[PDB]
Amino acid sequence: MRHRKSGRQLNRNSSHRQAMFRNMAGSLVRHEIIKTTLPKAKELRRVVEPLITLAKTDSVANRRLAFARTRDNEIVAKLFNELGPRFASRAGGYTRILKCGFAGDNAPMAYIELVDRSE
Amino acid sequence: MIGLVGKKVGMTRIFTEDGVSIPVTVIEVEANRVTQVKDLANDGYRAIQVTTGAKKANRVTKPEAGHFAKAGVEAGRGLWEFRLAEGEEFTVGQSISVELFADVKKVDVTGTSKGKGFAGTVKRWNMAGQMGNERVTVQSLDVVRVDAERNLLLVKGAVPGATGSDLIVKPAVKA
RNA sequence: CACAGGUGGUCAGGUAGAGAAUACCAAGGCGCUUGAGAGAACUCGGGUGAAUCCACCCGAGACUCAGUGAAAUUGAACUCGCUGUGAAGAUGCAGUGUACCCGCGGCAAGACGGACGGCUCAUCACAUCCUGGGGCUGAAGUAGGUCCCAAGGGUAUGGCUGUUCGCCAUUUAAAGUGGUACGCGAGCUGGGUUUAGAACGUCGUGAGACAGUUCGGUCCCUAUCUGCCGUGGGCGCUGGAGAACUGAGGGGGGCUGCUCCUAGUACGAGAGGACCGGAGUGGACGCAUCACUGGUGUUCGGGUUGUCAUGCCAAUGGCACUGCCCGGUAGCUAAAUGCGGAAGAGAUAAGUGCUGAAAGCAUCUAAGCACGAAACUUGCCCCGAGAUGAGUUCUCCCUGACCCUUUAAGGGUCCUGAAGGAACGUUGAAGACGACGACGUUGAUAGGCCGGGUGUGUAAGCGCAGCGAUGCGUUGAGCUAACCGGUACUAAUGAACCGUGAGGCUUAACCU
RNA sequence: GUGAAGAGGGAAACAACCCAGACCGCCAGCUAAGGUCCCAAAGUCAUGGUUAAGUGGGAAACGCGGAAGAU
RNA sequence: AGGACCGAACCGACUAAUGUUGAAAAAUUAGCGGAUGACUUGUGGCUGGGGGUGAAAGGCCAAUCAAACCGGGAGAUAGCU
RNA sequence: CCCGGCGAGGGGAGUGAAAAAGAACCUGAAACCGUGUACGUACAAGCAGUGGGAGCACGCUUAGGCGUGUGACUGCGUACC
């Protein structure tokens, strides 16, 4: 503990944290833009980027894994058809964080979106 | 006599011909070049300042850049001092290799303990206070192998601190 | 009090279920009154934009826990130690020493915090005891009494007496003796008294009390400063600033069993029997590490019972302690060890000594003049110039102008804004909060990706066999958070604030 | 006799020890106990003596010794 | 048929802890005990203060009992701060 | 009328003798909370006061040494019932 540790404390149940991560990842892949605190945005990016990278390759196993980790038929249907080819030539950095001004001393807020988000 | 400064990279085990496992620590010892010489007449005592590593010119402060340019040497990551044993005197810009420890077989290692949170009385003494960010000196350690071309030094047992820390190796005063 | 506490009857479904019990579901109700903010009027310095009328945001002063806000207490506090006196341990009396001002996290030498009694491992003496190790006592054994690093502050029966109790008897692992208000009645309790009800009667004008009666019974509060440890904001070391060290002072530990030969040598008639501490070998404790020897590792894989869902299977996700187990990445620990408590030196009590008397002897000393015990200090590991006596060394920068007065450690205005720091982001092996290391387009600081490593175990699909289960090649496959070397694919942009503009007075030495 | 019901000065401090009974004011001088190296105001004054142990600056009985005192 | 056994609701505070200006002027949590009997509960009524009640703790009688509240005796009281 | 949020609240103009009378409304001190004026305080030990005492800004005899606020230092100083 306190040495070479990844991930904030995030005091809460592990299952609740996983459900929250899945919900935020689904929201991001659906709307391609979210407003949330910097730690939450970073956690969402960390949890979603592996899914996007896996979705780059179209296969039955990849689709099944995405469905298992997302539990949304519509979301997986959207994936492997648009996001894949859109970011096929890009390795990493599929999401960007923009500072939307302010709390400053209570909790920061920022927008998390895709590299393009359109076109 | 004089000690060098190295960087910890890792620790592993070494097997001898007879088949004995001895813990060793990976320490990279860059050639320390003397930057300043302090004498009795001016500074009041005999000493030599040693610099190791390198830093980007952007982050190097102008006073430090001027001090390094005075000695005509590249700017390093820090400065260290060692007290001479009334022996031969070095000169500014004289690079020092790791050959000195190649014929001593006994060295002492000084490092910085890794930081840790507040510890209870039982944890510390078995008085509460700050743990880590403190000196750690280990003596009576014998160098296992010395590699001049690789600048790799091995010492029996472990050494203080974690990977990437800076340690100081000095001749074993005790004898 | 919209309280967390209490309120009588009826409606009583599905699955695994003997069960209205257990776990999830049908219809229905909820995600809880702390977890989380805008730009906060106004004021300053700025850059950006069509050339008066200005518009946008940053760096700041001005709110901050998105906050109302109570709590016993409080003569006034600028609330140090030791020694002596004192209606008796003096923060306040006399003498002496130390300490920069104001905060934060823990430990209480103790504040006589505040409103009799013993149950007390942390600093104390007797064997102290929230359950480590011991040494002695011609100890018959167990056991007492004597001693060490030490304070089980929850507990026997009893004489002197009042009971746990102040002296002690049997004590076992203690039933226990005071220091500190016997550390706390800011813990407990009465177990006898002045005090929960009886209770002989008392000293006692009376109050006040009877450590005297036989049984006794219900005892309150949310760290105020202070001492120690660590860590912060301001200021000063005299122009400012960044680094590296000397050093007045201060911090804690010097434990202990065996053997090899040295040497069965010396000494010693014989018996007897070392100095040798020359080298290795154990245990208690301290620093540090995870490659090795065990655990955790609710973030990783696999197996499995019930239940809901993905329209059904295969296969998955949610719940049943992480639903129950096999493990286990990095990290954190000990159940594992590299080292340590040196060697040596100074002065030492006792003791051992070169020449040597006073007082033709003697003698450790009178004259010249030397060692030495686990005692003391260096030597081993250190911090430390807030040491105001404010140190030493190296480096970087400012080389402007004008006006006025009460004409000097003077004041004011335009411009300049150096080195350095802070402001914000990535962040860490730094972290309660501060603070500290590295980077910010002149880049691997963080996220992801590439290939590898560890872990887990034969993922799904396909065709065959078994008319079920299930197996075969696909396949040492799939997945892998924290590990390794690169990748700018993404985030740290151009920037802006403080900080200056030649540095006071007197004197000695150099060309004027 | 003091305090009780009296200030002030000295004994380092102090209520009972010594001097001393304050009507008030004035930047004046002289005494008592106690001092005249400093702290702290006053002779480092003069003569005759004891003292080598800091006895002074804490001690009984007893043959200079007796003599061991409080973080 | 069990002052029978295990085990829900339910009942008792028997034990430990939570607090002693509390969430409550005696409550809460975790175990223990009964769980067809001397059981419990909804509602209505009676037993009244030198008295009632009391499977005898002199328990309880409106958060109080070795004799409760209200107005008068009483602006009471010997002694005392 | 303006700011403010199309509220509350505030600032102007007007009425009002007076708004130093605005519905919290005559006169308006203290304990307590903030800002400005001048001073002491970051090497300095105890009932925090009493005399001496250099300065810091201002008005005075327009210096000639006085007063409005402070004491770095120094002799003394164990609050009241």
Largest CA distance in chain B: 55
The structure was resolved to a resolution in Å of 3.7
Across the interface, whether the CB atoms of A2 and B117 are under 8 A apart is answered yes
> How many Cβ atoms are within 10 Å of A110's Cβ, its own excluded?
19
Which bases of chain C come closer than 7 Å to a protein CB?
36-39, 57-58, 63-66, 105-107, 229-231, 241-246, 285-292, 298-299, 310-311, 315-320, 322-323, 330-333, 337-342, 379-383, 392-397, 419-421, 425-432, 438-443, 447-450, 459-461, 478-484, 487, 489-492
The CA-based angle A32-A38-A39, given to 5 degrees, is 105
Chains A, B: CB contacts under 8 A, how many?
5
Looking at the DSSP assignment, which residues form a beta bridge with residue B111?
Answer: B136
User: Of B91, B98, B89, B88, nearest to B32 (Cα)?
Assistant: B98
Across the interface, whether the CB atoms of A3 and B117 are under 8 A apart is answered no
Whole-angstrom distance, CA of residue B84 vs CA of residue B91: 13
Identify the experimental approach: cryo-EM
Chain B residues 124-153 with Cβ under 7 Å of strand C are 124-141
Element (H, E) at B8: strand B4-15
Distance from CA of A78 to the nearest CA of B (A): 45
Across the interface, whether the CB atoms of A2 and B116 are under 8 A apart is answered yes
Q: Is the CB of A88 under 7 A from strand C?
A: no
Is the Cβ–Cβ distance between B128 and B119 less than 8 Å? yes
Answer left, alpha or beta for residue A4, where phi above 0 means left and psi between -120 and 50 means alpha. Answer: left
Domains and CATH numbers, chain A: 13-114 (3.90.1030.10)
Structure tokens at A83: 């996001």
Q: Kindly give the interhelix angle for A60-70 and A38-55, rounded to the nearest 10 degrees.
A: 160
Distance from CA of B12 to the nearest CA of A (A): 19
Does B66 lie at the interface with A, CB-CB under 8 angstroms?
no
Whole-angstrom distance, CA of residue B163 vs CA of residue A22: 36
B68 Cβ neighbours under 8 A, 6+ residues apart:
B35, B51, B60, B74, B75, B76
Answer left, alpha or beta for residue B18, where phi above 0 means left and psi between -120 and 50 means alpha. Answer: alpha
| CA distances (Å), origin A5, targets A50, A107, B29 | 19, 22, 29
> What is the total count of domains within chain B?
1
| CA distances (Å), origin B93, targets B48, B50, B69 | 11, 9, 11
Which residue range forms the structural domain that includes residue B7? 1-175
What size, in residues, is chain B? 175
Distance from CA of A25 to the nearest CA of B (A): 34
After which residues are there C–N gaps above 2.5 Å in chain A? Answer: 102
Nucleotide nearest to B115 (CA to C1'): C430
Interface of B with A in 112-141 (CB under 8 A): 114-117
